[PDB]
Design a protein around this ligand. Structure first.
Ligand code: BCL
Ligand code: BCL
Ligand code: BCL
Ligand code: BCL
Ligand SMILES: CC[C@H]1c2cc3[nH]c4c(c3C)C(=O)[C@H](C(=O)OC)c4c3nc(cc4[nH]c(cc(n2)[C@@H]1C)c(C(C)=O)c4C)[C@@H](C)[C@@H]3CCC(=O)OC/C=C(\C)CCC[C@H](C)CCC[C@H](C)CCCC(C)C
Ligand SMILES: CC[C@H]1c2cc3[nH]c4c(c3C)C(=O)[C@H](C(=O)OC)c4c3nc(cc4[nH]c(cc(n2)[C@@H]1C)c(C(C)=O)c4C)[C@@H](C)[C@@H]3CCC(=O)OC/C=C(\C)CCC[C@H](C)CCC[C@H](C)CCCC(C)C
Ligand SMILES: COC1=C(OC)C(=O)C(C/C=C(\C)CC/C=C(\C)CC/C=C(\C)CC/C=C(\C)CC/C=C(\C)CC/C=C(\C)CC/C=C(\C)CC/C=C(\C)CC/C=C(\C)CCC=C(C)C)=C(C)C1=O
Ligand SMILES: CCNc1nc(NC(C)(C)C)nc(SC)n1
Ligand SMILES: [Cl-]
Ligand SMILES: [Fe+2]
Lengths: 237, 281, 301
């Protein structure tokens, strides 16, 4: 019967679609590894997808996935156990070393570009026309950690130009240098900006930006990662 | 085994209960206290389904159905065979879902991300609890709840619906469907858009977010943006399930008639209600 | 408490983006509209510009003629009475021809001919718009994923209004133009066909509709949870994996044993949603033409 043929045919199609979808979702992270870094014997029942290639805009080269995969950075961690399935403990300061919830990825040390090739993220002071249009303006307000002490004052907002949104708060410390705090890790209030993640003394630990009018994808990961890592690692204060 | 980038994230910490006792993985799966709790509740609920199946005299998953107690039991416990197995399986289901959620929270803490996912999964849980717990309690009996079987639960939806005429007329059911339909529409569009920028026309460089914005501006005169759309998808899906729960918690508790009667608050209103013409006059 | 990134704390307005030129003909691009502070709390504030080419205006004009045809018939059912119009707005219905007329365009205006005229305008309006989702993408150098997923919706629509009624031999099998009437048609359709719950394609369509709400709740939550590492910027994560992508995947790998990638999840998304209308179209198309009674058919096969 024709409905029987339709339904049975669809289940064949759906198993084929799932298979394709799961291999499409193996273009990063695979092949799986043992805990010592070497390739694992068991890789699951779905095969590695055969490579594809994205041509990146603005002369940025090309990404091939899947392909040669490394962390290309030191991982300060040590095995907790002989067998598999156990945690790996930080050998050092996990916040400054970039592990666990303080982790970052070795992304390209260049800034994200919009469609006309200019920097995507710029401080509002170097962004002709940009102003706070609604809600509380945080510029000039004290920045307060979770030990309730003042780490500094907000001196600017770094905006995603194409999307028109506030991404970071540039904060001046005791010593006069500045750091970027992601906007989704702050609570702007009528008389201060509160950062639950970090205590005041730990803001200097936030990695710094090389150039003062641009931020690279590598620096953003280092920054974002370090701040969110504070939720675990600064917590005992 | 591990993903190539996973090792650096497999640190101790994040647990709410048990300290470091259950702080480990089985293969890919994180365990935690709530992983052993999930397993205990899921193990026990599955064993009780299989017991219900030996009692029903079938192994066919198409036919296995665990019915809740008859209405005459009210909110009392019932003997295993006559609704007691449903009651225990429901308790086990509830403890598994809540434990799964709390386990997601532990996983969130270890990875230092927001708690948006378990907060969201909680709406599904509340919808389940509406059909299985809240509505039955307000209505006076566990028997008003749905039976656990692949086809028998559909018949429950049919019988419950047709108790109130066409259930389409439930105004909160209309809002929920609107949110469901709009959700799938939105998911299709977002999935397409990202894919259309990442996988552009042959002989073209990968597109930027500006292209995504420009496409939705050209087509519709408005782009909600990358943050906005993921906000929107979350809002739509959650709203759909919230108005699902709402439309059921009011059915048979503060509303008892055919749902089509609701709409007379508009038709039979005194001033235009008499006027000759139209459909209802 | 902890900031959730559902609504923005501080909005920021700047020079409006006029957008990417690429191969777009700027002659058909309108001026920039104003900013909405209300929309800005949730998404972008900028309104417009919009593109309105030869195909977009055809679509707008046919879509309006559809609305003005349904509307002129609703007024006539009301006896030209504005009070009666508002009261019974949801109860008015432009019904198709009765079965006696079969697939003929020869029905008088007042008994289904106006339905055929409405259907013509809606047919031109949808297909004009579909060509438009295609052309907008082409001009920007993008993939045609939006057009191909849109065909899935058009397919369900085409079956309800056109392909099913034609194989059934009468326009009377099509869906009437009314708020409440289209719901009643939906209920009769299931009753007539021996309970649509037992149509396996209806049950698939449900699995995908429910599954679309599941998947968007998952992905929306996921991205908001990693927006603190710039996770909403999905294209740069595809080109250059960031810790946002990595944490997202590990959240799910640890939770359910397997995960997606930043690109890959959007493939899960487009298929989950597309399979709603794809399966649904098939299931409706098979009702009446091949299977009279789904419950009965189910108990044998
Ligand atoms: C799928 C099976 C049924 C059907 C069953 C239902 C049910 C059930 C409901 C609707 C509801 C609606 N349907 Mg319907 N609907 C059908 C076919 C259609 C067609 C069509 C033939 O193209 C159209 C234009 C509509 C349009 C509409 C809306 C007026 C309304 C809200 C949906 C929504 O938010 O959409 C997306 C919104 C955008 C802005 C895009 N329906 C088919 C025939 N429809 C709901 C309602 O509120 O009724 C008044 C409702 O509860
Ligand atoms: C004749 C039947 C009636 C009717 C009677 C009813 C009744 C009765 C109900 C609905 C409900 C719903 N109806 Mg109706 N409905 C009708 C026609 C329609 C039409 C239509 C096209 O005409 C539409 C679009 C809908 C749409 C809907 C939805 C809005 C809603 C179900 C979603 C939901 O609640 O999710 C909620 C999600 C859940 C409950 C899922 C819970 C998930 C849990 C937490 C996790 C499970 C984990 C699992 C065990 C693990 C598996 C393990 C491994 C994977 C192996 N109905 C007709 C008119 N409808 C229901 C509703 O709103 O209920 C709240 C409801 O009770
Ligand atoms: C929401 C309103 C009604 C309802 C109305 C309908 C209607 C109408 C339909 C379904 C259908 C289904 N419903 Mg239901 N369903 C309800 C509540 C539930 C609950 C619950 C505990 O709350 C569960 C687990 C299910 C599960 C299911 C699936 C068996 C089936 C496909 C849905 C799907 O893929 O969703 C999306 C989810 C995913 C894509 C994730 C995967 C979920 C997997 C596939 C579910 C496996 C369930 C498994 C057999 C449960 C046993 C677990 C073991 C004991 C370990 N329903 C409530 C009571 N349900 C469809 C069907 O074909 O029924 C036969 C269908 O047409
Ligand atoms: C008593 C009634 C029956 C029933 C009878 C039917 C019938 C009949 C049908 C469904 C259909 C569906 N039912 Mg049902 N359904 C019932 C109970 C349920 C229940 C439940 C009890 O929980 C659920 C979850 C569902 C769920 C579903 C969906 C999975 C499916 C609709 C998918 C869709 O996306 O359509 C919405 C999307 C569209 C209709 C696409 C149309 C898009 C067009 C092209 C856009 C035009 C826009 C227009 C120009 C104007 C607006 C534009 C503005 C300018 C913005 N049904 C009951 C049992 N159901 C449909 C299906 O596919 O079934 C196989 C269908 O035909
Ligand atoms: C609220 C918006 C939508 C939503 C969101 C959502 N669902 C979610 C999540 C989110 C955010 C998760 O994080 C979580 C997840 O991990 O998914 C991958 C989940 C989830 N949604 C799931 C299912 C599900 N969600 C559904 C719906 C929705 N989920 C909503 C539409 C539906 C339906 C019917 O529409 C289903 C079937 C699971 C895949 C997963 C939760 C997995 C879980 O809880 O695991 C622990 C429990 C077990 C392993 C088994 C428990 C066994 C029980 C003791 C026995 C079964 C009893 C049951 C009551 C009988 C059912 C018989 C039926 C035939 C009626
Ligand atoms: C995968 C199936 C889902 C889906 C997908 C979908 N709908 C789509 C698209 C896609 C991919 C478009 O690209 C197109 C669009 O441009 O949306 C903003 C569209 C669209 N979906 C629309 C409506 C719509 N889609 C619906 C359903 C769905 N759309 C499904 C849930 C529904 C219902 C009833 O659930 C409606 C009412 C329109 C907003 C638009 C088609 C616009 C159009 O044809 O306009 C002509 C009329 C005028 C110009 C007069 C004014
Ligand atoms: C950007 O990020 C994103 C990812 O990562 C980059 C992700 O992976 C995910 C996660 C989503 C996927 C991998 C897509 C597939 C997901 C679904 C279709 C949802 C259905 C889920 C299942 C059927 C799996 C159920 C698994 C369970 C519960 C196993 C139970 C076993 C025990 C040990 C108990 C999302 C949302 C995402 O947004
Ligand atoms: C870059 C995000 N742009 C965007 N914009 C819009 N606009 C509406 C209002 C149609 C949802 N949608 C998407 S996907 C739905 N993405
Ligand atoms: Cl056009
Ligand atoms: Fe996304």
């Amino acid at each position: 019967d024709l409905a029987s043929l339709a339904i049975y045919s669809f289940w064949i199609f759906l198993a084929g679609l799932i298979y394709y979808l799961q291999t499409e979702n193996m273009r990063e992270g695979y092949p799986l590894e043992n805990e010592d870094g070497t390739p694992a014997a068991n890789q699951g029942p779905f095969p590695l997808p055969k490579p594809k290639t994205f041509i990146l805009p603005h002369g940025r080269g090309t990404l091939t996935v899947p392909g040669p995969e490394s962390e290309d950075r030191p991982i300060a961690l040590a095995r907790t156990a002989v067998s598999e399935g156990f945690p790996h403990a930080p050998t050092g300061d996990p916040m400054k070393d970039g592990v666990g919830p303080a982790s970052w990825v070795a992304r390209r040390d260049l800034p994200e570009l919009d469609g006309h090739g200019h920097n995507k993220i710029k401080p509002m002071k170097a962004a002709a026309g940009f102003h706070v249009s609604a809600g509380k303006n945080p510029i000039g307000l004290p920045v307060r950690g979770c030990d309730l002490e003042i780490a500094g004052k907000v001196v600017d907002i770094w905006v995603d130009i194409p999307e028109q949104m506030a991404r970071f708060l540039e904060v001046e410390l005791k010593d006069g240098s500045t750091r970027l705090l992601p906007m989704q890790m702050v609570k702007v209030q009528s008389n201060r900006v509160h950062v639950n993640a970090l205590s005041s003394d730990l803001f200097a630990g936030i990695p710094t930006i090389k150039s003062p009018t641009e931020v690279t994808l590598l620096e953003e990961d280092k920054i974002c990662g370090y701040v969110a890592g504070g939720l675990m690692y600064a917590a005992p204060k | 085994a591990l993903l190539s980038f996973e090792r650096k994230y497999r640190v101790p910490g994040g647990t709410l209960v048990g300290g470091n006792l259950f702080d480990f993985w089985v293969g890919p799966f994180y365990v935690g206290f709530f992983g052993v709790a999930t397993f205990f509740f899921a193990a026990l609920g599955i064993i009780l389904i299989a017991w219900s199946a030996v009692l029903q005299g079938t192994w066919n998953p198409q036919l296995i159905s665990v019915y809740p107690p008859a209405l005459e039991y009210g909110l009392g416990g019932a003997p295993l065979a006559k609704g007691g197995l449903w009651q225990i399986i429901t308790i086990c289901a509830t403890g598994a879902f809540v434990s799964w959620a709390l386990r997601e929270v532990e996983i969130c803490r270890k990875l230092g991300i927001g708690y948006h996912i378990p907060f969201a999964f909680a709406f599904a849980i509340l919808a389940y609890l509406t059909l299985v717990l809240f509505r039955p309690v307000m209505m006076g009996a566990w028997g008003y709840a749905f039976p656990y079987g692949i086809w028998t639960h559909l018949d429950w939806v049919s019988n419950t619906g047709y108790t109130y005429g066409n259930f389409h007329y439930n105004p909160a059911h209309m809002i929920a469907i609107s949110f469901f339909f709009t959700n799938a529409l939105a998911l299709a569009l977002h999935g397409a858009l990202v894919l259309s920028a990442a996988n552009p026309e042959k002989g073209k460089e990968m597109r930027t977010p500006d292209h995504e914005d420009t496409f939705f501006r050209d087509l519709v005169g408005y782009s909600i943006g990358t943050l906005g759309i993921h906000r929107l998808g979350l809002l739509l899906s959650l709203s759909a399930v919230f108005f699902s729960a709402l439309c059921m918690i009011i059915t048979g508790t503060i509303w008892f008639d055919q749902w089509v009667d609701w709409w007379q608050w508009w038709v039979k209103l005194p001033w235009w209600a008499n006027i000759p013409g139209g459909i209802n006059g | 408490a902890e900031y959730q990134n559902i609504f923005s704390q501080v909005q920021v307005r700047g020079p409006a983006d006029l957008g990417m030129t690429e191969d777009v003909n700027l002659a058909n691009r309108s001026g920039v509209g104003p900013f909405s502070t209300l929309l800005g709390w949730f998404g972008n504030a900028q309104l417009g510009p919009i593109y309105l080419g030869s195909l977009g205006v055809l679509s707008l004009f046919s879509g309006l003629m559809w609305f003005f045809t349904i509307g002129i018939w609703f007024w006539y059912q009301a006896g030209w009475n504005p009070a009666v119009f508002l009261r019974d707005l949801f109860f008015f219905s432009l019904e198709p021809p009765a079965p006696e007329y079969g697939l003929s365009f020869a029905a008088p205006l007042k008994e289904g001919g106006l339905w055929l005229i409405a259907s013509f305008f809606m047919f031109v309006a949808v297909w004009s718009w579909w060509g438009r989702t295609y052309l907008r993408a082409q001009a920007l150098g993008m993939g045609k994923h939006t057009a191909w997923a849109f065909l899935s919706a058009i397919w369900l629509w085409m079956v309800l209004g056109f392909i099913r009624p034609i194989l059934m031999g009468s326009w009377s099998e099509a869906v009437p133009y009314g708020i409440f009437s289209h719901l009643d048609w939906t209920n009769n359709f299931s009753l007539v066909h021996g309970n649509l719950f037992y149509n396996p394609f209806h049950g698939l369509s449900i699995a995908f509709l429910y599954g679309s709400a599941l998947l968007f709740a998952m992905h929306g939550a996921t991205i908001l949870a990693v927006s603190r590492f710039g996770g909403e910027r999905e294209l740069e994560q595809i080109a250059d994996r960031g810790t946002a992508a990595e944490r997202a995947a590990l959240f799910w790998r640890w939770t359910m044993g397997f995960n997606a990638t930043m690109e890959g999840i959007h493939r899960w998304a487009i298929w989950m949603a597309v399979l709603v209308t794809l399966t649904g179209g098939i299931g409706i198309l098979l009702s009446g033409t091949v299977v009279d009674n789904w419950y009965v058919w189910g108990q044998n096969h």
